[PDB]
Design a protein around this ligand. Structure first.
Ligand SMILES: *[C@@H]1O[C@H](CO)[C@@H](O[C@@H]2O[C@H](CO)[C@@H](O)[C@H](O)[C@H]2NC(C)=O)[C@H](O)[C@H]1NC(C)=O
Ligand SMILES: *[C@@H]1O[C@H](CO)[C@@H](O[C@@H]2O[C@H](CO)[C@@H](O)[C@H](O)[C@H]2NC(C)=O)[C@H](O)[C@H]1NC(C)=O
Ligand SMILES: *[C@@H]1O[C@H](CO)[C@@H](O)[C@H](O)[C@H]1NC(C)=O
Ligand SMILES: *[C@@H]1O[C@H](CO)[C@@H](O)[C@H](O)[C@H]1NC(C)=O
Lengths: 49, 49
């Protein structure tokens, strides 16, 4: 996926792996190493007039 | 069964009239929507990811 990775304060339960938004797309994910918790947010975008 | 309205009967006769002797200044409200929230969508960002 493409996005920005930022530090997250979400308290995952030890067994929990993903984090899903309303649209069932991975919002918060756990990296295989360091067992860290991140946020996945789409890059800046918008309309042009 | 819903009460259709308060029952009433006005005394009608062909030589009698009723004329007010006092008045009452009344204020009433009325709410009307004018414009909703302007919205816009992005085609590819929604259909695709
Ligand atoms: C003016 O007089 C008429 C009759 O004298 C009144 O009409 C009657 O009003 C009473 C009120 O309790 C009713 O019970 C009667 O049925 C009415 N008469 C008829 C024939 O229906 C009238 O109400 C009077 N005006 C006012 C403002 O009270
Ligand atoms: C018309 O109605 C008004 C209000 O319903 C009357 O004014 C009232 O008069 C009494 C006695 O003079 C006072 O105690 C109230 O405080 C008044 N009310 C208000 C809101 O000022 C008035 O008297 C009526 N008209 C007539 C000719 O009696
Ligand atoms: C891989 O990462 C884990 C998490 O810190 C660490 O304990 C381990 O030593 C690392 N192993 C290698 C080969 O880098
Ligand atoms: C009013 O109607 C009655 C019948 O209900 C009638 O007798 C009377 O003449 C009428 N009034 C007038 C002024 O004609």
């Amino acid at each position: 996926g493409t996005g920005v990775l930022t530090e997250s304060n979400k308290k995952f339960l030890p067994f929990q792996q993903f984090g899903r938004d309303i649209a069932d797309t991975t919002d918060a994910v756990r990296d295989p190493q360091t067992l860290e918790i991140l946020d996945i947010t789409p890059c800046s975008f918008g309309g042009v007039s | 069964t819903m009460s259709l309205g308060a029952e009433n009967s006005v005394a009608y006769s062909n030589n009698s009239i009723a004329i007010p002797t006092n008045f009452t200044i009344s204020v009433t409200t009325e709410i009307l929507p004018v414009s909703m929230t302007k919205t816009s969508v992005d085609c590819t960002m929604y259909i695709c990811g």
